[PDB]
Design a protein around this ligand. Structure first.
Ligand code: PKW
Ligand code: PKW
Ligand code: CL
Ligand code: CL
Lengths: 304, 304
């Protein structure tokens, strides 16, 4: 028992991290096969960030202007191209530590681990979720750009995020491994405000099932609700609308605990309306929404 | 910016995990050099756990009764010994992935990362702290025994914990890499209740400094306190007494933010007395105590 904000083991992704330097800018790159992926703003000065024409800035850069360093040895860049907001630097050596991998674009509500890096060196690993406003609440400093978000399916690493930017409000923006930003953000130092950060209802429900599985049962009540009834309360609390797909997704957790999905919805409805009353659930004084129903099943069953 | 419960990169420790089987019991082992460390209860049946005489049970076991499997290849056990509550299985091959390492016994309040494993395979990584009652609030299931807790100092892994047991209240108990349990726990299936789980005051103060560093400043007040005055309030809230050593430890965070340690103590004193009033600090509705002052500095400066 016990339920923790758990990240995937990072070793497979640590073996992919490299340092990319272009001129006076140094960020992280992801080395898979003979390609190094990094944010295209590696080609900018802090002044170019204000209004960058990336296609024009890139005309002035050649293969030798990109200094790629894996560990403490230099990689030879034999080609470079821009795919959306990422640069792909073709090197002459295939990464020997390249794991089985995929590039996936995730939906809001989905969770992933992040291996925060500085100068191609991993500093830490943590779990976060793609918010409904397409930002992430990470922990990134200057030099952390190029750090990646991922999920592991036994031996296959599914890369879903590359860190690019920090909005004025401290939240984070980035792209998938094809260079397409999550949400409306652009790689420009311009005022970009995120939209409403709603709560991922399906994830809160999954976390309430993890609490019942791990012995926290105080919040369980004698009521039930309907999808329409629960969604009226959820809207009022800036919770995402719950769909029949989310109910289906919760099916296995509902089977494991014997608590019907709509009964758990009524438990959540009362927690929203009454508050925690100074109580905690899985060591938390707030309703956690960064555990998907798949994460709950994986952690509670011990998938390796 | 952004402040997350961050674990150390786990790759160095993933390369040490092996599966240890003795009879019908299978748990995890830590392979460093030509030695495999694992909990001594690998030699017990679920019935032996009730009242085990380990020295007697071990008489019946030979080198060939310990099946050590690294990845999918078997290791040859050429010796075995019991050190306190751990078994050291000498193998004929030195682990090629053995990192630079140390065995350290940590004090309560200290934090470390845990790489949870099942059948020698890493399933996840998370951060936790040695509680003042010498338990940890981990996430471990049946088969997770032998999973280790560690800290990294650049390239040196300091192993501080091996998981052994789950108390009836869901909390966790284990030993250091010398086999000595943290606290009073014994490797017996007997009623063992943990003592008071007090809050690690120095860690809460360090986390309040991380909040000010990352822009959460609402809780800052116009008051100051003394060590004696703050400790009267802290005792009443089951907070650990704050010492001049803890004040000295906070010195650098105090310098970075310009907020005197005793001023932050008064901020904490008011949060304890008034509550959060439905507000959050670093995305938390409760005062987090599993970040040491060293963790705050490391994460906020990006030590790799
Ligand atoms: C500067 N900085 C501090 N903590 C950060 C965490 N993550 C990222 C950054 N970096 C940025 O956001 C830079 C700074 C200049 O403005 C822009 C504009 C667009 C883009 Cl794509 C990147 C950036 C951080
Ligand atoms: C059974 N189990 C379930 N979730 C666990 C998480 N961590 C550990 C265990 N295992 C144990 O605690 C076993 C079960 C039998 O009782 C004892 C007694 C002493 C010792 Cl050292 C180990 C154990 C877990
Ligand atoms: Cl910006
Ligand atoms: Cl027990």
């Amino acid at each position: 028992s016990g339920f923790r904000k758990m990240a995937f083991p990072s070793g497979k992704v640590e073996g992919c991290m490299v340092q990319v330097t272009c001129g006076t800018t140094t960020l992280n790159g992801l080395w898979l096969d003979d390609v190094v992926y990094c944010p295209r703003h590696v080609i900018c000065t802090s002044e170019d960030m204000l209004n960058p024409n990336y296609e024009d800035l890139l005309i002035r850069k050649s293969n030798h202007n990109f200094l790629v360093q894996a560990g403490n040895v230099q990689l030879r860049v034999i080609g470079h191209s821009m795919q959306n907001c990422v640069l792909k630097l073709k090197v002459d050596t295939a990464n020997p530590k390249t794991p089985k991998y995929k590039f996936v674009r995730i939906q809001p509500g989905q969770t992933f681990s992040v291996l925060a890096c500085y100068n191609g060196s991993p500093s830490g690993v943590y779990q976060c979720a793609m918010r409904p406003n397409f930002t992430i609440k990470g922990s990134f400093l200057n030099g952390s750009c190029g750090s990646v978000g991922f999920n592991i399916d036994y031996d296959c690493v599914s890369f879903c995020y590359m860190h690019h930017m920090e909005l004025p409000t401290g939240v984070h923006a980035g792209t998938d491994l094809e260079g397409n930003f999550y949400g409306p953000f652009v790689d420009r130092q311009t005022a970009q405000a995120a939209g409403t950060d709603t709560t991922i209802t399906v994830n809160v429900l999954a976390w309430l099932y993890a609490a019942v599985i791990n012995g926290d049962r105080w919040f369980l009540n004698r009521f039930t609700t309907t999808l329409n009834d629960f969604n009226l309360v959820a809207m009022k609390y800036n919770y995402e609308p719950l769909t029949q797909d989310h109910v289906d997704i919760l099916g296995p957790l509902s089977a494991q605990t014997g608590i019907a999905v709509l009964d758990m919805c009524a438990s959540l409805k009362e927690l929203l309306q009454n508050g925690m009353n100074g109580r905690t659930i899985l060591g938390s004084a707030l309703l956690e929404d960064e555990f998907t129903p798949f994460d709950v099943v994986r952690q509670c069953s011990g998938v390796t």
